[PDB]
Amino acid sequence: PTLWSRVTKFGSGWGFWVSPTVFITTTHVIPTSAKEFFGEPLTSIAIHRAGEFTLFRFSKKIRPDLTGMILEEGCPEGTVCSVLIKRDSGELLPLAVRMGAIASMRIQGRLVHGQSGMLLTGANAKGMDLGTIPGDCGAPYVYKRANDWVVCGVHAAATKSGNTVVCAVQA
Amino acid sequence: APPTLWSRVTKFGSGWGFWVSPTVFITTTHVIPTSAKEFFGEPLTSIAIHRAGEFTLFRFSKKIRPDLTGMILEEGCPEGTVCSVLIKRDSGELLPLAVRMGAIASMRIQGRLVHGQSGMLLTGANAKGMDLGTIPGDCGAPYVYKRANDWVVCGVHAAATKSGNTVVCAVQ
Ligand SMILES: Nc1nnc(-c2ccc(O)cc2)s1
Numbered sequence A: 001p002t003l004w005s006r007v008t009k010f011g012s013g014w015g016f017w018v019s020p021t022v023f024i025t026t027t028h029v030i031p032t033s034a035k036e037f038f039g040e041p042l043t044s045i046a047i048h049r050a051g052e053f054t055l056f057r058f059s060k061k062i063r064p065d066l067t068g069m070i071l072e073e074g075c076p077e078g079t080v081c082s083v084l085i086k087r088d089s090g091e092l093l094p095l096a097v098r099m100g101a102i103a104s105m106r107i108q109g110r111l112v113h114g115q116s117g118m119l120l121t122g123a124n125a126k127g128m129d130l131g132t133i134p135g136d137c138g139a140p141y142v143y144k145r146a147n148d149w150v151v152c153g154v155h156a157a158a159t160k161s162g163n164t165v166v167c168a169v170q171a
Numbered sequence B: 001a002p003p004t005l006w007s008r009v010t011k012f013g014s015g016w017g018f019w020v021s022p023t024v025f026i027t028t029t030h031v032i033p034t035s036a037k038e039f040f041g042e043p044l045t046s047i048a049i050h051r052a053g054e055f056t057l058f059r060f061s062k063k064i065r066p067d068l069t070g071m072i073l074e075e076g077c078p079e080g081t082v083c084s085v086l087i088k089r090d091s092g093e094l095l096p097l098a099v100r101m102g103a104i105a106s107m108r109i110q111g112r113l114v115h116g117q118s119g120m121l122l123t124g125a126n127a128k129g130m131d132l133g134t135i136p137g138d139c140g141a142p143y144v145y146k147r148a149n150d151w152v153v154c155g156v157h158a159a160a161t162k163s164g165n166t167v168v169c170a171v172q
């Protein structure tokens, strides 16, 4: 029983199973041509979009091995989240992120709205194993609170150092 | 981390060891099977053993891993160096956990006395549990870091606190 089981390759990045029926990802990684996802006809899937945040709800249990998790709109300022990065190499890369305010930020030429954060590995990501790269978009932001894991958003963007990041959030 | 470093990480006793060269193998002293009289088809008598607390080095009289080149082993690393701990987990999953290295320290952990180079994991607020942190079976996994032009190995996983971010690297 692991959080990592819920991180799934999806379009040009990743997504996360909140429940047996609920899948979250970053809008810009979703395929733009499709009749079905995970074997289910697109005609039977509810899609809820808010900027760079997308939620899918399926009409049957795709992952009945899972329990439903808490999903919240971002987290308090100063929370140290973990971004759960999967790589095509086979690497699992949980990185600490100190979270700040919600904002519209300029990132490599584009405007991105979500919760800002800064990696604790700091300086420059120097090595692919201490920061994010473009293929990582849709990875989840999580933290432990009392006994429960909380998911509060998905990886939307990062500056050239790979050290300022944006977490797209619900609503 | 490069495939040539993960190929050196070998399942061993109750954890792992690390091939520094074709003839040199390092591990954490407490993962060694205390009854073992033979390793990789060689008798104990044909092997040189160097032991300093939780650090153990094996030197063989012939090439066990001829596919490898010798790499640099140092005695810990400068304070503030960021290392990866190269942890293998269930079914080809590779978990290179980020750690900021601190001072040489002596601690009591789970009642046991441990000595080596302390570090603070950079994976979450606290690393309690297997998704963000280390578990007993991780002991012996190597601490590596990249410099300008190459990679260095600077010790082996010896211990971690109950419910915190603190780990200890046994050093030469
Ligand atoms: N549109 C929706 N917003 N939240 C939903 C949710 C959250 C947590 C769960 O475990 C399952 C569903 S549905």
Ligand SMILES: Nc1nnc(-c2ccc(O)cc2)s1
Pocket (backbone or CB within 6 Å): B020, B021, B024, B050, B057, B069, B070, B071, B072, B073
């Ligand atoms: N006693 C020893 N300390 N270091 C050794 C070493 C280092 C790098 C190598 O490639 C091979 C051996 S032997």
